[PDB]
């Protein structure tokens, strides 16, 4: 009875998707002016990570970025002058995520030690010290995103997105619904919703206030490794192991467009939009990133300058440059 | 004012002094990943290393090893195993006694061997609880060919060095399981990565030397491949 009722509920959901699929984004946007061949050159290369860079996060000022490497270092770089503002020795060498607070006062990181450690940069003492440890997750911390100086949203490998109160260090809200390791987040501009791709080819739109899954999107054929909202916050794009990126629209609730190429048989590690959202920047496992025209699904260009797998990708909040970490321990900035 | 520029430059000189100081320590220390199961006996081998994740230190001949056992995670390991692609070697520990679970360890070995990211890492494969394997063969109740029909057409390899007072039946069994692992190792592993099979029990006072010894062969061959020798 349960199996039949659940399956028959999916029928009208699929029917309403086909009903509202009046046309295709390709058909509507087939007459727009193409973005044309885009050539971004490496502007600065940041050196001094010993091991592979796994994560990276820009600051809100578009100047400082924080990078994590698999050797217990959280180096905060100055992208203008290429200087190490701070180097934080992490307790566990294995760190899979890092976030820089919107205020820039604190910096977070976590990995296979199951703890989203918060480090206080504004300590009056010589160097930085660990602010608080966030225990309560039972799986590798895939991603950690700040909401404000006291609220942090985390993801783990135990199908658990959690929202924490860093003052008390207690998991206030837990988000449950994923059937797979949750690999990434993306907060909406207003920080009221956040999407979350997991290892079950299903991105779920969560509600921060309620803790309930507002919507669930499928269309991918493998683990989703990256996800990012469109800068307005009414859509998002995802990157999976099936060597394609799919753009989903919250209000329409279908797969608007897919970014796949015949010669590409490598998964996507990271995606990110430009400030205008016209370019999608997907970081492939074939050691370079490709710049997809988000409205035409055309390869505008390629950022080929990494020796190893591209692990992370960021665009500054003013959009003036694109950082790109990789497993070759080198953090390059593009423009 | 130019004062802030010099202080920013001054910190970078002090920061990059610390990174160089800790770079020597990081490169001089070998990282290992320990893998197995509930009944494998990873817990017993880490006890022999007396010289959410579990960090084991042992010093052999003034060389530091970090042995990383991962405890916290779920049974799905296809995304956190990508962290350990830069390790020296994967210490894969197998329970050779339980033949029911022994096919699952072969599939786990195959996924590691053929992994797009682990395809350049050597595996120091340990076949633990060989004492419990011997008493299983001698009893005769548990039959290998029930699980592995190919064992009916197997003979002890010519490269066999049985221990004194070892029954022929044990050596025929204990080498069929080893040889079964090496079918996957020799199918696709071509100089990129190497398997180092071994036979350990719970009462051995070694497996730290063997890791030290097998790591030295891994590092020796790594150097020789750069010189286009191997």
């Amino acid at each position, epitope marked *: 009875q349960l*199996r039949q009722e659940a399956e028959q509920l*999916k029928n009208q959901i699929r029917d309403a998707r086909k009903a509202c699929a009046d046309a295709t984004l390709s058909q509507i946007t087939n007459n727009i002016d193409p973005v044309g061949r885009i050539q971004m050159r490496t502007r600065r290369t940041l050196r001094g990570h010993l091991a592979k860079i796994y994560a990276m996060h820009w600051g809100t000022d578009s100047r400082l970025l924080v990078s994590a490497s698999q050797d217990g270092k959280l180096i905060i770089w100055d992208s203008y002058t290429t200087n190490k503002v701070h180097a934080i020795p992490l307790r566990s060498s294995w760190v899979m995520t890092c976030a820089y607070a919107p205020s820039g006062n604190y910096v977070a990181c976590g990995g296979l030690d199951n703890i989203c450690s918060i480090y206080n940069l504004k300590t009056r003492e010589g160097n930085v010290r660990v602010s608080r440890e966030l225990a309560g997750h039972t799986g590798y911390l895939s991603c950690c995103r700040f909401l404000d100086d006291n609220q942090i949203v985390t993801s783990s490998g135990d*199908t658990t997105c959690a929202l924490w109160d860093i003052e008390t260090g207690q998991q206030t809200t837990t988000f449950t619904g994923h*059937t*797979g390791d949750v690999m990434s987040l993306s907060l909406a501009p207003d920080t009221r919703l956040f999407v979350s791709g997991a*290892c*079950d*080819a299903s991105a779920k739109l969560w509600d921060v206030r309620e803790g309930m899954c507002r919507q669930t999107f*499928t*269309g991918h*054929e*493998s*683990d989703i490794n990256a996800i990012c909202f469109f800068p307005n916050g009414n859509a998002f794009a995802t990157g999976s*192991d*099936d*060597a394609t990126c799919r753009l989903f629209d919250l209000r329409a609730d279908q797969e608007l467009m897919t970014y796949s190429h015949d010669n590409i*048989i490598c*998964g996507i590690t990271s995606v990110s939009f430009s400030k205008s959202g016209r370019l999608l920047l997907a970081g492939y496992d074939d050691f370079n990133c490709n710049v997809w025209d988000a409205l035409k699904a055309d390869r505008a260009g390629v950022l080929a300058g990494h020796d190893n797998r591209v692990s992370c990708l960021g665009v500054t909040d003013d959009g003036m440059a694109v950082a790109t970490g990789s497993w070759d321990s080198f953090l390059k900035i593009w423009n | 004012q130019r004062n802030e520029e010099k202080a920013q430059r001054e910190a970078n000189k002090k920061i990059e002094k610390q990174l160089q100081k800790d770079k020597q320590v990081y490169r001089a220390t070998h990282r290992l990943l320990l893998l197995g199961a509930d009944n494998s006996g990873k817990s017993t081998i880490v006890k022999q290393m007396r010289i959410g994740i579990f960090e084991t230190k042992f010093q052999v001949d003034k060389v530091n090893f970090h042995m990383f056992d991962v405890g916290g995670q*779920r*049974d*799905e*390991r*296809r995304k956190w*195993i990508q962290c350990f692609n830069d390790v020296t070697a994967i210490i894969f520990v197998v329970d050779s006694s339980d033949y029911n679970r022994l*096919q*699952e360890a072969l*599939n786990l070995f*195959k*996924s*590691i*061997w*053929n*992994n*797009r990211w682990l395809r350049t890492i050597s595996v120091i494969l340990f076949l633990n609880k060989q004492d419990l394997l011997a008493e299983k063969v001698l009893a005769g109740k548990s039959k290998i060919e*029930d*699980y*592995f*029909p*190919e064992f009916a057409r197997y003979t002890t390899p010519e490269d066999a060095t049985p221990e004194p007072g070892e029954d022929p039946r044990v050596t025929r069994a204990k080498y069929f399981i080893r040889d079964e692992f090496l079918r996957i190792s020799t199918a*696709s592993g071509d100089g990129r990565h190497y398997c180092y099979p071994h036979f350990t029990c719970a009462v051995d006072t070694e497996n730290a030397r063997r890791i030290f010894n097998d790591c030295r062969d891994i590092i020796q061959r790594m150097h020789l491949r750069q010189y286009e020798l191997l």
Partner: nanobody
Framework: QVQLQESGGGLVQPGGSLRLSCAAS????????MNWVRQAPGKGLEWVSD????????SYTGSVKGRFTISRDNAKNTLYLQMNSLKPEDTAVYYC?????????????????????RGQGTQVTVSS
């Protein structure tokens, strides 16, 4: 959506023949190394057999080697497990498990407790 709906299964006397069919949907069938896994009553998941992308390389658990035949039909996007001889040991639920990544010979996590790309499963029980 990725969907795997197995068919076949039921009571067959020992020595019987049974044809399990796995109709894949919502992905390119031709890429993934399809597997077969089964769960004995009061027992953990175990792997039965697999098949490569084009059907080249085929392996079996050994407990069913020579008794079970596996083939994939890329025309209709279907997987098969032709059973020849059944033992009372074979009583289990067969799940049609798919390989996570599309173009790789490795297959991590197919026998996992909560794997995503596995089918619902069909009870295959043997008795007279």
């Amino acid at each position: 959506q990725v969907q795997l709906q197995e068919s076949g299964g039921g009571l067959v006397q020992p020595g019987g023949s049974l044809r399990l069919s796995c109709a894949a949907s919502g992905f390119t069938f031709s890429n993934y190394k399809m597997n077969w896994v089964r769960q004995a009553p009061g027992k953990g998941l175990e792997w039965v057999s697999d098949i490569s992308q084009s059907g080249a390389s085929i392996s079996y658990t050994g407990s069913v080697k020579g008794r079970f035949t596996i083939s994939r039909d890329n025309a209709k996007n279907t997987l098969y497990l032709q059973m020849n001889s059944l033992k009372p040991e074979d009583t289990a639920v067969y799940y049609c498990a798919r390989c996570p990544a599309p173009f790789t010979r490795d297959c991590f996590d197919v026998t996992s407790t909560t794997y995503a790309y596995r089918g619902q499963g069909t009870q295959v029980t043997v008795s007279s």
